[PDB]
Amino acid sequence: PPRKVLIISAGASHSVALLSGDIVCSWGRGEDGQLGHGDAEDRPSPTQLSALDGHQIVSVTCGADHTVAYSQSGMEVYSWGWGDFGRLGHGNSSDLFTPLPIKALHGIRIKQIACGDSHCLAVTMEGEVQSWGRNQNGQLGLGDTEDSLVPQKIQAFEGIRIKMVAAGAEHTAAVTEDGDLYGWGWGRYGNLGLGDRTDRLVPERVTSTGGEKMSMVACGWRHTISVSYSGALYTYGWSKYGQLGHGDLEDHLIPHKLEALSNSFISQISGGWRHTMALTSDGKLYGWGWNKFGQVGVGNNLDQCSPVQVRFPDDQKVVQVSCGWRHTLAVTERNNVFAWGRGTNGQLGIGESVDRNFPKIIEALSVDG
Template sequence: MASSFSSSVIAWGSGEDGQLGIGNNEEREWVCVVQAIESQNVRSVVAGSRNSLAICDDGKLFTWGWNQRGTLGHPPETKTENIPSQVKALANVKIVQAAIGGWHCLAVDDEGRAYAWGGNEYGQCGEEPERKDDTGRPLRRDIVIPQRCAPKLVVRQVAAGGTHSVVLTREGYVWTWGQPWPPGDIKQISVPVRVQGLENVRLIAVGAFHNLALQEDGTLWAWGNNEYGQLGTGDTQPRSQPIPVQGLSGLTLVDIAAGGWHSTALTDDGEVYGWGRGEHGRLGFGDNDKSSKMVPQRVQLLAGEDIVQVSCGGTHSVALTRDGRMYSFGRGDHGRLGYGRKVTTGQPMEVPINLPAPKSVSGSGAEGHWISKLVACGGRHTLALVEWKADESKP
């Protein structure tokens, strides 16, 4: 018989905007449980620059954190909300994936319909009826209640940057709107435009102002801001059109991630490659090398760990191993590395998941431990999905 397992959402790091969801605005240097959503079956979590969201198996969406711009999907009653609440406007659809940008959010349901809400001053929430101010300029108001965006597209994945939005359609094309970087001379920024030269795309990842797209054939493309080499093109020139990322030939890539100004790619044999901004050690190349990298380099300090996911935050990163351990590295203030020391380091260190056993097993004498299934790094905080794994009983 399948063992019943218990899962939890955990959080650590800065709590000043309520983004930890623990009922206060304190920071945490160790992991803690987000109690308010313990009764929900959460399937994924997303950490933004100052807020957080969780998607449940039944398609419910919960948000918490900073809400000055309607980023939580309902009108702001207070600037910050430190307890998760359900996004009522999306209660009748089944949300399967979501993203948080600078101060806007995107979500997609099981039928491929996309939704946007939050800050909209760059048109990042998408098409809208044309309103003009007294001087005849288009007026863009924040969207505090989620509404459909990109209505003509059937969407598979949404991704959000600082001031722009990117979606991957079911046919494998990439579309974008909002204020890209470099800004260029785009007039209609709130209308989705197809990114030329990309097809058969499997995955997209978006940083503050740069974009990555992984094709089915394993080629990785990048475009946008390149100030720190985060496009992996060997230089620091921004690109308005996709360009292949260098230094990855011969590797089979299975996942990609983009942080504020850095990027990572993961190979099928669990190896991590990092590039872009190296300050604070967020690339994981050790304490003697916190320089930026203009082409991907293998993260030797994670070699042999069999990494299955990497998440990149504003100034830190977390790598997840196949057996459910998490390694964090980068900037350490606010406790964002999760192991009780606010030291900034380029040395990946394990995040201990020291939580009591779930109530369903406590007292039964069953030994076990918590393992992580998914990690999400935000601006100054991290979320993870953990589940209880019973230790194999000795015969």
């Protein structure tokens, strides 16, 4: 049976994928150790992370300049990349150019991991949450502003099963199994959804959600995206570059329904640095926001303040999407992988290349060419 991409994830300037046979590979900027190959060099094409061969990795997640992965059979979480503020979770600030197990998480059943710029969160199968890394604005949700070099349990969520979490530059969001939405950390651009511009040191519930329950949440750098049980899309926080998608540049301090997508059901969402992607249940991908380097994928370099459909060869349906800072990655129904946007660190994975403003196929990972 042919090799397939199972998971993709984009960081600020790098890209990581998990392939069938439990193979991790990475490409793009390598200077901070984020690719995990032991050296500090950029890789313009997908490169196998040999140190994780045989570790039965089942998922990968990129932060800005670090990467995390976990194995079910090994009951192990691994991290690598820039080490400052404890974002790697090992009880020190050392960078890592090769994956190491986060000892504190050994033997814990992992449901999901989220990574921001300088902090990370892990959700367990029992719906508990542990966090680590930078905490200067309360983003760990632990009630103070002191960085944590190791994972700590968020006590605020005792008795509250968390479904998924998300992390931006210096903020955090979560949805519960029963559909409640929370935000905490740096809040100056309205990105917590709480109706003001003030930080929170512990999770606070978002009360104005259209009377709707939320099924998922994602964070861009200073904006936040959520989807309701009815598949309606909400965005809040910073819209300097139109990344909220409402057809203007206004900030929102509470979740605001993106009306232009109301006749679609949103199945996946991703927040980039200054851009946004949303995938419909019919496999149509929509992008908006900052487009200087073509990362919106619509064949130009003009910013887009309303969602525009990203087009693929033969109209093949999209199934996964992940936003980096200046680039975007996607996987289609045909098991093809596409990249677009900034390419100077090799993050597009298409060998040496100029920037691209519409989707370009990654031959190394695709069935087509």
